[PDB]
Design a protein around this ligand. Sequence first.
Ligand SMILES: CC(C)c1noc(C2CCN(c3ncnc(Nc4ccc(S(C)(=O)=O)cc4F)c3[N+](=O)[O-])CC2)n1
Lengths: 339, 289, 58, 128, 235
Amino acid sequence: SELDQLRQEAEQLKNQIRDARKACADATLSQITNNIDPVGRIQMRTRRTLRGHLAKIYAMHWGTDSRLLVSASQDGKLIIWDSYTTNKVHAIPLRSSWVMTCAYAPSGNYVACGGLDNICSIYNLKTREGNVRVSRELAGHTGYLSCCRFLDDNQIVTSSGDTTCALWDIETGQQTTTFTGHTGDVMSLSLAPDTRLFVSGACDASAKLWDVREGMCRQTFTGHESDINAICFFPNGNAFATGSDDATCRLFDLRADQELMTYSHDNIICGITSVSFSKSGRLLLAGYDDFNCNVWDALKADRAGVLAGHDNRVSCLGVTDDGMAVATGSWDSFLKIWN
Amino acid sequence: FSFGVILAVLASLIIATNTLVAVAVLLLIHKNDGVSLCFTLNLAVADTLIGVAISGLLTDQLSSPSRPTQKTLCSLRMAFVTSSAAASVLTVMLITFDRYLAIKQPFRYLKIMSGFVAGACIAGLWLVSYLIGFLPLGIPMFQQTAYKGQCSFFAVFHPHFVLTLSCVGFFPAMLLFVFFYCDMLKIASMHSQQIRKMEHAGAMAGGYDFKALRTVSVLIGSFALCWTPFLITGIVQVACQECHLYLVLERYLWLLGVGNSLLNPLIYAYWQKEVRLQLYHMALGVKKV
Amino acid sequence: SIAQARKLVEQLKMEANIDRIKVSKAAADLMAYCEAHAKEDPLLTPVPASENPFREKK
Amino acid sequence: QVQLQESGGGLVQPGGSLRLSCAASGFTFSNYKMNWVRQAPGKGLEWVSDISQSGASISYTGSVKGRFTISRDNAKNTLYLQMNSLKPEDTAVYYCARCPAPFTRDCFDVTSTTYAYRGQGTQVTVSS
Amino acid sequence: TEDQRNEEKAQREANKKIEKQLQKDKQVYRATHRLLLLGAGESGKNTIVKQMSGIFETKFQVDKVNFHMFDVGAQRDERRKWIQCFNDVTAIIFVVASSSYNQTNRLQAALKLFDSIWNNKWLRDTSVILFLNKQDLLAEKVLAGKSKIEDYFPEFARYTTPEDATPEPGEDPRVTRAKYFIRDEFLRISTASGDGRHYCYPHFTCAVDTENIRRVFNDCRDIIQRMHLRQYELL
Ligand SMILES: CC(C)c1noc(C2CCN(c3ncnc(Nc4ccc(S(C)(=O)=O)cc4F)c3[N+](=O)[O-])CC2)n1
């Protein structure tokens, strides 16, 4: 009846979009950065190793001062470390021992954590009574929390395993808005430098660009062949990079609305767990299932370096806002800082 | 004069093969959380101290026409060697006992095992070793009467000391060792039979041995043949008036006992897969650079 | 079924009516941004050891 | 975009034969292990058959052994299913599913509803 | 400098307090065994939760040993992304309804799920306790001539019950045959790629007088023992 007819319209629109993208695809980035001088080899050596987590770490997030960081592990702990002096500043137990994400507020007053409880917990760091306590338990998702980011000290954006993203209001713990359209579990999330848009990656091998205030999907990006595990905006917010289980990273442009580079090598057959950029955007760092990290020249798609100090799967990767140090976290329960 | 060159070779080889193992275990302590790795490190340290003591003894054995040293100095050197070897044996006993608790009572072992128990056990064994090595100096009927300036064991210590270490020492430890590994072998055999029965049942409907014995025999033989000839020859010498054995007990059979510090790194550290892998990694890193 | 079929088409009509610039312009702009900030990237370009806050000591 | 199109099928008398085909595009077909799944009316999705990366390892359900044959061609990016002897209880929609990840020997969620890497499905009905 | 020294001292003291608390928490964590319960809609899984958000907790204590069991609820049927959480679990209790060979085939779906779990690259060192549930329903299904394992498992024709079987008295041989056929259908998957790192522990149960916690306790003890024996080259 109604079906098997409107799908013809959908196919026609897909054909028209693909034809327009093919027409707009004038040249390639490979034949524009042909003369760009390669970075060569890059040696970054571990400087700190942070010990204290009993089980594997899933998430880490730097602070805006590029000094403090927070890490989440399955022994039920959220640990706030001082990257300088290797000291521990805070240790917070959790009601649920199964956490998959942690976020640190830009102001430095709150942290947030999630997990298989389908609840986002907000912890207050600056209080006069006691030391730390949970101030809000955002509930309403019907799947596991996979990522969460702070927009302000009052708003938060979460992604779940129920294929929907949500924007909350921490003052009252209410779902301000819901972003729908993904057909698979939403795994990653990245905020634009101006915090006006945000990109999400899911398990249907597609990325989506959302406008925060209106709640609609501006653009859909395809090209990956498997689940997307990580996303990161470019420093200027006009492009982003994705990592997938098909053992390749990709670069997408928002204005051109298509792919620019694929970063892969025949020696890699393991999926990417995390991606991040450098301060100037020349270097793209990726963490893999084969226990290593690879540093790619983001303009020429040649592997420029390797960070190898881990014994298990590497799952966390982050770069400071100063562009000074990188932090990696692995399933062997160790946090490492490189430079 | 072969007793100088063979002693030098043995001491150098022992130190070279044990400092590397100690460094490997230190590198693994930070990476892992293993209480048995503390015992492995203690064994390597005890072997290194055996090497140091033998190197200290080497001067007199090496060709040096010299005035006799002293009553006291020879006693101190003998006591140092005896304490080192006693520690190196009690460490193996402690490792075996730890394995037996790990396997026999798997739950309440996880409940009451930490770093404090390891520290207390190691401190206790070191205190016991240096107490029993230095015991004969402060007790009579263990030391010779006179003509003790020329340094040599059994010339400042009575043969009754070896009889005592044989009676209340080595043999009860060996009986405990054999009982522990026999029980472990029995448990392993039951588990292996269950595994094999299930595997045959699985492969029957889908179309289409001797491993614990070898390891148990290797461990028991290593703990056995190193010191037993020395102690039985000491018993034979004590029980009859054939004093010529005083020569043999110092020159050939004693070397056999020192050999126990060469099999120990090869058994309790080389078989451990991760120790071997880290040894390979460090060998590659050093040789390449 | 039919219910979401009435939506997936609409989104497509909302995604085909946007403006796309050529890949050459976007690639050139991205490369220019990368080469205009190489003087403040402590990973691409090195930093003097005094300024580095991490490698001061063990 | 990862796309799969099933072709063939339809109305056939009992004892007839069909040859379902599945054309895949958007991914390297030689890296993935493929499946045929089916859904009878008023029932849940039910795994039917699968084939490995090289075609060496093949498996079926108990109810379809000796009648259904799975095949694949890597140079033509195609997956075929030959149905030889058909019964009233074979009336169903047949889907061509793909494993979520390459180079893996496990295959988790090809039978769950709302699975991304599945085809549209072709209807097979045996009536008379 | 004086402010810097004061801040350094205060930070060191706070770190020391955190270290003490973390040491106590590690001592607690090392002595607790965590289990993952895994079933289906009607496979059982609720008579085991009985009689001792998005995840349901169960604490129990047998012979002074603590066990924490984690039941997955309010999570949809796709599992490849959250199953990887349970790779450091001491055991996965997989419950299967044995009488459901009549989706029109739930036993085959259980076999497929068990195959996926067994061959997962992140679950290479996790042992599976397998509970074949609802023996009574299978008994009255097989005693009657309503439905046969044959024409759903065509190889059931040339299957002979093993000589090592220990049937309960009052059990017909033609029921023991079906029970052990299902058991062997699971073991064919289990023993093809075990490699010595993990093992299956099948069991038969319908509703037993709290024998199930004893079975779980014994299987966990055997798992720890086999791990240690493999570590010491004795197995
Ligand atoms: C389990 C405990 C109680 C234990 N029960 O027994 C032992 C071992 C057996 C006794 N121990 C020694 N007994 C006598 N003499 C020894 N050394 C020695 C050194 C130098 C010369 S020399 C320069 O004259 O040639 C001669 C020697 F005999 C040793 N020793 O090797 O240390 C070793 C530990 N542990």
